Scaffold this active site. Structure first.
Site, mmCIF file in Angstrom:
data_model
loop_
_atom_site.group_PDB
_atom_site.id
_atom_site.type_symbol
_atom_site.label_atom_id
_atom_site.label_comp_id
_atom_site.label_asym_id
_atom_site.label_seq_id
_atom_site.Cartn_x
_atom_site.Cartn_y
_atom_site.Cartn_z
ATOM 1 N N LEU A 144 10.927 -3.639 -8.129
ATOM 2 C CA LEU A 144 12.107 -3.953 -7.335
ATOM 3 C C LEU A 144 11.849 -5.209 -6.517
ATOM 4 C CD1 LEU A 144 12.959 -0.327 -6.579
ATOM 5 C CD2 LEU A 144 14.186 -1.871 -8.057
ATOM 6 N N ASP A 154 9.558 11.761 3.112
ATOM 7 C CA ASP A 154 9.075 10.534 3.749
ATOM 8 C C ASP A 154 10.135 9.436 3.714
ATOM 9 O OD1 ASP A 154 7.273 9.074 5.208
ATOM 10 O OD2 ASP A 154 6.040 8.495 3.481
ATOM 11 N N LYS A 178 0.835 -1.195 0.000
ATOM 12 C CA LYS A 178 0.000 0.000 0.000
ATOM 13 C C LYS A 178 0.874 1.251 0.000
ATOM 14 C CE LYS A 178 -4.752 -0.112 1.491
ATOM 15 N NZ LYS A 178 -5.696 -1.244 1.683
ATOM 16 N N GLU A 214 -3.134 1.284 -4.033
ATOM 17 C CA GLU A 214 -2.641 -0.057 -3.736
ATOM 18 C C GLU A 214 -1.656 -0.489 -4.809
ATOM 19 O OE1 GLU A 214 -6.207 -2.526 -3.252
ATOM 20 O OE2 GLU A 214 -5.911 -2.243 -1.084
ATOM 21 N N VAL A 215 -0.646 -1.273 -4.434
ATOM 22 C CA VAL A 215 0.405 -1.657 -5.372
ATOM 23 C C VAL A 215 0.408 -3.160 -5.642
ATOM 24 C CG1 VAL A 215 2.873 -1.605 -5.878
ATOM 25 C CG2 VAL A 215 1.815 0.245 -4.515
HETATM 26 O O1 LIG Z 1 5.920 1.353 -4.903
HETATM 27 C C1 LIG Z 1 5.846 0.384 -4.115
HETATM 28 N N1 LIG Z 1 6.438 -0.805 -4.361
HETATM 29 C C2 LIG Z 1 7.230 -1.155 -5.412
HETATM 30 C C3 LIG Z 1 7.589 -0.416 -6.536
HETATM 31 N N2 LIG Z 1 8.387 -1.196 -7.278
HETATM 32 N N3 LIG Z 1 8.553 -2.362 -6.727
HETATM 33 C C4 LIG Z 1 7.854 -2.402 -5.578
HETATM 34 C C5 LIG Z 1 7.832 -3.526 -4.713
HETATM 35 N N4 LIG Z 1 7.163 -3.591 -3.540
HETATM 36 C C6 LIG Z 1 7.404 -4.807 -3.020
HETATM 37 C C7 LIG Z 1 6.950 -5.395 -1.826
HETATM 38 C C8 LIG Z 1 7.357 -6.717 -1.496
HETATM 39 C C9 LIG Z 1 6.915 -7.358 -0.220
HETATM 40 N N5 LIG Z 1 5.975 -8.531 -0.275
HETATM 41 C C10 LIG Z 1 4.546 -8.102 -0.364
HETATM 42 C C11 LIG Z 1 3.598 -9.323 -0.407
HETATM 43 O O2 LIG Z 1 3.789 -10.153 0.758
HETATM 44 C C12 LIG Z 1 5.149 -10.625 0.895
HETATM 45 C C13 LIG Z 1 6.171 -9.458 0.894
HETATM 46 C C14 LIG Z 1 8.232 -7.413 -2.381
HETATM 47 C C15 LIG Z 1 8.674 -6.810 -3.582
HETATM 48 C C16 LIG Z 1 8.249 -5.500 -3.878
HETATM 49 N N6 LIG Z 1 8.494 -4.688 -4.917
HETATM 50 N N7 LIG Z 1 5.151 0.461 -2.957
HETATM 51 C C17 LIG Z 1 5.355 -0.400 -1.843
HETATM 52 C C18 LIG Z 1 4.636 -1.760 -1.861
HETATM 53 C C19 LIG Z 1 4.118 -0.627 -0.963
#
Ligand SMILES: O=C(Nc1c[nH]nc1-c1nc2cc(CN3CCOCC3)ccc2[nH]1)NC1CC1
Ligand SMILES: [Cl-]
Length: 289
Positions: free
Chosen positions: A94, A136, A24, A29-30
């Protein structure tokens, strides 16, 4: 007009395969997704515009700031799509998740801490040179690639300095990580990020920021009135001094990001980012249980 907004004829449900929810953001939501043309994995931020507004300006601002960044240390933005009432924001994926996630199996060592802080500092140096303030900075907004690359994310409250607006005064951020001058809504600039960096350093060392056991409202008077936090515990003196350098109540007494890249804690302990893949592997084995 929204930067990177795609042809409204384009259907993101056709262009992308939307997979599981991964988090989130400050807005929206992502999801993990697949680009159906390249087959690369992307991150997809979805915001419902009919449920929003009063946040729409802020969403526009986040996308604008992202679209203006071109750095290996800032999450790339690939464009935005509209599907009915929902905005799909396509982001660089990522695969390593956040530094906060990577802390769940257990403590970091100081080489890992120094390496992650160094890469955050590279990102801040870039942003601050572009007259941008992140506002942030915290471990949850520090993301790692599958290769151990470290990038800044969530520009939901990022600010822009101009020649008519040399300082900002907006109350934004996450309370535990907010600089005293931001909480007091005094005029502030990029030095606010340096304070947040100091808190993030404690977070990476101890697993949580100072005051983490308290109600967020209490830090609204605690942070401006108390002496700054220090890093307590059996940590190297250079790490403790790095934290102290960042956490000074006087913003002009905090070093710049550029200066902190040469701090003895960083130079003595940081190593190549590729070693951080060990940290991702640890998390993988851990959540496998
Ligand atoms: O912009 C975001 N994320 C990302 C942008 N690019 N890549 C991401 C990203 N966010 C990531 C978050 C996770 C963690 N998992 C979530 C599901 O349950 C197991 C752990 C793993 C890999 C991720 N890659 N926001 C963050 C999620 C709230
Ligand atoms: Cl710990």
């Amino acid at each position: 007009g929204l930067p990177g907004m795609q042809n409204l004829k384009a259907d993101p449900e056709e262009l992308f395969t939307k997979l599981e929810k991964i988090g989130k953001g400050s807005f929206g939501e992502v999801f993990k997704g697949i680009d159906n043309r390249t087959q690369k994995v992307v991150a997809i931020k979805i915001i419902d515009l009919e449920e929003a507004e009063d946040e729409i300006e802020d969403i526009q601002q986040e996308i604008t700031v992202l679209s203006q960044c071109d750095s290996p240390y800032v999450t790339k933005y690939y464009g935005s799509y509209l599907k009915d009432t929902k905005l799909w924001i396509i982001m660089e994926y990522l695969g390593g998740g956040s530094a906060l996630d990577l802390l769940e199996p257990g403590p970091l060592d100081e080489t890992q801490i120094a390496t992650i802080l160094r890469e955050i500092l590279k990102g801040l140096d870039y942003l601050h040179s572009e007259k941008k303030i992140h506002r942030d900075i915290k471990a949850a907004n520090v993301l790692l690639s599958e290769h151990g690359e470290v990038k800044l994310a969530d520009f939901g409250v990022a600010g822009q300095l101009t020649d008519t607006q040399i300082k900002r005064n907006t109350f934004v951020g996450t309370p535990f990580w907010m600089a005293p001058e931001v909480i007091k809504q005094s005029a502030y600039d990029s030095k606010a990020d340096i304070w947040s960096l100091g808190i993030t350093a404690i977070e990476l060392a101890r697993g949580e920021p100072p005051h983490s056991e308290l109600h967020p409202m209490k830090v609204l008077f605690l942070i401006p009135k108390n002496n700054p936090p220090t890093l307590e515990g059996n940590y190297s003196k250079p790490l403790k001094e790095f934290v102290e350098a960042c956490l000074n109540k006087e913003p002009s007494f905090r070093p710049t990001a550029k200066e902190l890249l040469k701090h003895k804690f960083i130079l003595r302990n940081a190593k190549k980012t590729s070693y951080l893949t060990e940290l991702i592997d640890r998390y993988k084995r851990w959540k496998a249980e």
